[PDB]
Amino acid sequence: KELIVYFSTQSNNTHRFVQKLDAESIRIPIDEEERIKVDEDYVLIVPTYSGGKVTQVDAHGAVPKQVIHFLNDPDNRKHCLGVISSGNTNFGDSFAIAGPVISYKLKVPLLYQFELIGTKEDVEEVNRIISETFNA
Amino acid sequence: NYYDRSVSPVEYAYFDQSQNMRAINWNKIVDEKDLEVWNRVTQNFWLPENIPVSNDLPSWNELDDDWQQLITRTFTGLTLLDTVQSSIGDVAQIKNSLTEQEQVIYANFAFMVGVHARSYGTIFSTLCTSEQIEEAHEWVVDNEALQARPKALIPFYTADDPLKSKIAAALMPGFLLYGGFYLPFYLSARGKLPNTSDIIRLILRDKVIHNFYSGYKYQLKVAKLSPEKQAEMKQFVFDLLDKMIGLEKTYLHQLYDGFGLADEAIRFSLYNAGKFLQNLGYESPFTKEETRIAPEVFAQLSARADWDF
Numbered sequence: 001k002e003l004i005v006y007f008s009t010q011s012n013n014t015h016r017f018v019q020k021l022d023a024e025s026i027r028i029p030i031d032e033e034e035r036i037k038v039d040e041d042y043v044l045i046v047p048t049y050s051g052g053k054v055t056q057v058d059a060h061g062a063v064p065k066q067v068i069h070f071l072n073d074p075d076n077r078k079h080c081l082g083v084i085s086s087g088n089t090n091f092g093d094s095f096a097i098a099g100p101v102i103s104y105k106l107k108v109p110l111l112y113q114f115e116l117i118g119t120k121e122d123v124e125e126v127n128r129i130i131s132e133t134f135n136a
Numbered sequence: 137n138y139y140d141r142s143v144s145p146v147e148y149a150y151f152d153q154s155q156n157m158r159a160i161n162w163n164k165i166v167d168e169k170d171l172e173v174w175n176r177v178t179q180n181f182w183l184p185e186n187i188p189v190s191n192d193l194p195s196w197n198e199l200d201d202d203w204q205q206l207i208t209r210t211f212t213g214l215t216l217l218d219t220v221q222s223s224i225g226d227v228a229q230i231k232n233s234l235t236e237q238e239q240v241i242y243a244n245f246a247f248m249v250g251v252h253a254r255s256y257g258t259i260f261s262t263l264c265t266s267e268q269i270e271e272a273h274e275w276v277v278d279n280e281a282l283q284a285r286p287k288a289l290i291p292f293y294t295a296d297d298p299l300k301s302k303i304a305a306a307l308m309p310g311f312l313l314y315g316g317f318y319l320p321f322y323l324s325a326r327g328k329l330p331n332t333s334d335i336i337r338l339i340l341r342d343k344v345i346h347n348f349y350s351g352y353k354y355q356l357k358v359a360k361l362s363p364e365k366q367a368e369m370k371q372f373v374f375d376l377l378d379k380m381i382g383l384e385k386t387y388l389h390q391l392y393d394g395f396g397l398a399d400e401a402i403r404f405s406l407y408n409a410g411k412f413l414q415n416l417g418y419e420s421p422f423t424k425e426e427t428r429i430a431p432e433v434f435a436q437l438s439a440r441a442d443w444d445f
């Protein structure tokens with residue numbers, strides 16, 4: 001029962017990375033009027049959208065609103081085994097900070113960080129980390 | 137519907153005078169990604185005046201004339217590329233926009249890349265002499281390897297193929313300046329010119345969105361072409377990047393001649409070439425190994441490398 005829950009905006013970078021992974025995936029809807037229920041254990045994969053805001057790093061909007069809405073449902077929240085976050089290192093100290101923020105809020109491990117649609121190595125590594133997360 | 141029987145002014149001006157003009161509609165938005173990008177780049181507005189590089193004087197005066205000259209030459213070289221993108225590259229994108237908001241976003245890009253070019257002047261004004269400044273300008277004008285890079289991109293901006301113009305618009309912030317951005321991060325890893333690195337980090341925060349957005353708009357247009365023309369555009373991208381990697385390598389080996397920075401600078405360049413390809417929707421062929429730089433230098437780029445509960 002390997003499962004990914006993920007979010008991706010209209011740019012579909014995170015979507016394309018997840019479709020390269022072995023495990024089955026479920027997409028959190030872009031439309032803020034729509035919600036999903038997940039009743040099985042999952043690894044969460046989300047991009048970062050804080051936009052490198054500074055006050056010190058400002059983590060406001062790091063986690064997309066649709067991901068917050070999804071995690072706000074305690075039925076969904078309890079099934080999260082860990083978070084993988086994405087972004088771009090050119091955002092500096094704000095790189096992939098959606099991961100740490102979710103890791104802290106849920107009390108779950110930050111399993112991996114990657115960029116854009118990911119590389120061959122990212123697929124190989126995330127496949128292994130998800131397998132070990134569900135086995136352990 | 138008014139929208140489907142009217143054209144934006146820039147469409148009217150350059151492509152179609154047979155229809156009346158519609159004002160930009162910010163109340164009924166075609167693409168939410170435009171609003172996302174507009175809000176971030178406008179909220180991220182900054183000016184070099186608000187970063188005091190006077191505190192770099194101590195670490196700057198400890199550097200010998202060769203290192204001071206390297207920094208001045210490198211940054212004047214980046215000033216040229218920003219001048220190209222501000223005055224030609226980003227403004228050329230306006231008329232080729234898919235949406236109304238995109239026309240205004242590229243006007244922001246042109247202004248803010250102008251601010252990037254201006255920021256190098258703020259650094260030189262504080263640290264360098266009138267002689268050091270004019271020498272760097274002379275050196276940029278007479279450096280054929282430097283000149284070759286913008287000379288290869290400008291034709292796409294002035295020619296009538298919007299997709300090739302868009303690829304050039306993504307390649308500039310996505311790839312071409314990172315060979316130069318290595319130097320300030322290399323120096324700041326040794327506690328040298330730390331306030332200068334704060335300006336570079338503000339520049340990168342803009343350029344990362346510029347590359348993403350140009351890449352995003354490229355993918356929306358190519359997706360409408362036949363599978364044959366899509367394959368032709370992919371071949372053009374890899375061919376153009378191959379050529380630009382060639383010219384960049386030639387330039388960086390001359391720029392960093394006798395400093396031993398060329399190898400790492402080129403690996404950092406290829407790392408960013410990989411991200412350029414990905415934001416055009418193409419797989420990066422570069423391994424983790426051949427794009428690797430020193431952890432302490434990468435740390436200077438990124439140290440990271442409604443709730444109901």
Ligand SMILES: Cc1cc2nc3c(=O)[nH]c(=O)nc-3n(C[C@H](O)[C@H](O)[C@H](O)COP(=O)(O)O)c2cc1C
Pocket residue numbers: 007008009010011012013014015047048049050051052053062086087088089091094095096097115116117172173176345348
């Ligand atoms: C407006 C905007 C803000 C962004 N902010 C950040 C950020 O704070 N940190 C980061 O690592 N990446 C940031 N990124 C990069 C995105 O996370 C990256 O493009 C990602 O691949 C987008 O995923 P998606 O296409 O699935 O939405 C930002 C991108 C945009 C367009």
Ligand SMILES: [Ca+2]
Pocket residue numbers: 087088344345348415
């Ligand atoms: Ca990006």
Ligand SMILES: [Cu+]
Pocket residue numbers: 204205208263264265268269
């Ligand atoms: Cu100088």
Ligand SMILES: [Cu+]
Pocket residue numbers: 221245249309342343346347
């Ligand atoms: Cu730019």
